[PDB]
Amino acid sequence: GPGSKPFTLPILTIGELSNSRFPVPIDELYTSPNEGVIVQPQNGRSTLDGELLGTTQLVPSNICALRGRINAQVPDDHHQWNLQVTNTNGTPFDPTEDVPAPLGTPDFLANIYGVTSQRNPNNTCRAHDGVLATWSPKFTPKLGSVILGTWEESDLDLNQPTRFTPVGLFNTDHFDQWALPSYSGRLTLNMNLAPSVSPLFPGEQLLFFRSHIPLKGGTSDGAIDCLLPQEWIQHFYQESAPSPTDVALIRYTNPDTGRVLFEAKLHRQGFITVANSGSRPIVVPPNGYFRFDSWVNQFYSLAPM
Numbered sequence: 001g002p003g004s005k006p007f008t009l010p011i012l013t014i015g016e017l018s019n020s021r022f023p024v025p026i027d028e029l030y031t032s033p034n035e036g037v038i039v040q041p042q043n044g045r046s047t048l049d050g051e052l053l054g055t056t057q058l059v060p061s062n063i064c065a066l067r068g069r070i071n072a073q074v075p076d077d078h079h080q081w082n083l084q085v086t087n088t089n090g091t092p093f094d095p096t097e098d099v100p101a102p103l104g105t106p107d108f109l110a111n112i113y114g115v116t117s118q119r120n121p122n123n124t125c126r127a128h129d130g131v132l133a134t135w136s137p138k139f140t141p142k143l144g145s146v147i148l149g150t151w152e153e154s155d156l157d158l159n160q161p162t163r164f165t166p167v168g169l170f171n172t173d174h175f176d177q178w179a180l181p182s183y184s185g186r187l188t189l190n191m192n193l194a195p196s197v198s199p200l201f202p203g204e205q206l207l208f209f210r211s212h213i214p215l216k217g218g219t220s221d222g223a224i225d226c227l228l229p230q231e232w233i234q235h236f237y238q239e240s241a242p243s244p245t246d247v248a249l250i251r252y253t254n255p256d257t258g259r260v261l262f263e264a265k266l267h268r269q270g271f272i273t274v275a276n277s278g279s280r281p282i283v284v285p286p287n288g289y290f291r292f293d294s295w296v297n298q299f300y301s302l303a304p305m
């Protein structure tokens with residue numbers, strides 16, 4: 001009946017899923033206590049009924065991308081360029097909109113390696129590799145501007161359409177996947193944030209969809225953990241199915257036999273918990289996927305993984 005459209009998950013195996021916090025495929029499922037850290041990502045956030053939260057948007061190639069025009073080079077460091085940002089879909093950025101930053105803006109501290117490209121009205125073009133430092137005092141996307149750094153010191157034009165394509169980490173300096181940038185810079189609080197998430201029942205931990213992103217030099221697992229894959233967010237946005245309780249019970253199922261491997265709790269706020277203790281990667285059957293079973297409550301006791 002009206003108000004009771006059945007909730008569903010898309011039929012997608014792990015090799016058919018994308019990270020919602022960096023534009024790469026999912027590599028594995030992962031669980032960890034993250035004891036003492038506040039888990040509050042702003043990309044990859046949606047309710048189960050299809051309301052996108054934080055800085056989350058639908059287009060996979062706009063995750064961690066920037067668009068705008070360069071108004072000036074920094075006089076005393078010609079490696080630095082001031083980018084006046086627009087939205088990644090091309091529309092002007094309205095700082096009065098009730099979001100933390102332009103949709104798709106990176107949600108973690110890092111030196112992000114990527115490429116800055118331009119095309120002029122006469123179709124002359126240029127591109128140069130470089131670094132987006134999301135920890136810099138000049139990373140102020142909510143105010144409309146960020147700094148780009150490049151090895152190139154001359155061949156970028158002012159007042160021409162510009163895009164930043166992210167590739168990975170440049171190095172590990174300042175890298176912390178759970179530390180949010182200060183979107184308006186020094187001494188100013190972030191606004192309109194999606195809330196932090198945590199397990200709320202003893203014996204449970206968050207379950208993440210993990211990718212190991214590229215690193216240009218150094219030592220790191222490159223781990224970026226998202227709460228929901230991008231395809232699930234895209235599915236819920238189209239379906240708009242109401243949530244009648246706080247938690248959907250989901251089961252990882254092999255479709256050819258019906259055998260169920262393990263179960264988990266999918267919370268209406270858009271994250272997963274499992275009964276497990278300790279940090280561990282999981283291996284799933286390549287042909288399996290999560291399926292909706294029933295609606296339960298916050299206090300339902302799961303079978304341990």
Ligand SMILES: C[C@H](CCC(=O)NCCS(=O)(=O)O)[C@H]1CC[C@H]2[C@@H]3[C@H](O)C[C@@H]4C[C@H](O)CC[C@]4(C)[C@H]3CC[C@]12C
Nearest residue numbers: 079080111130131132133136137138147148149150151
């Ligand atoms: C402009 C960026 C942030 C600088 C910053 O805010 N520093 C802090 C100033 S304060 O002490 O807080 O006042 C810096 C951080 C990393 C820098 C880059 C990296 O060091 C790698 C590259 C090094 C090359 O010598 C120049 C280009 C190269 C690509 C740099 C350009 C400028 C970057 C991108």
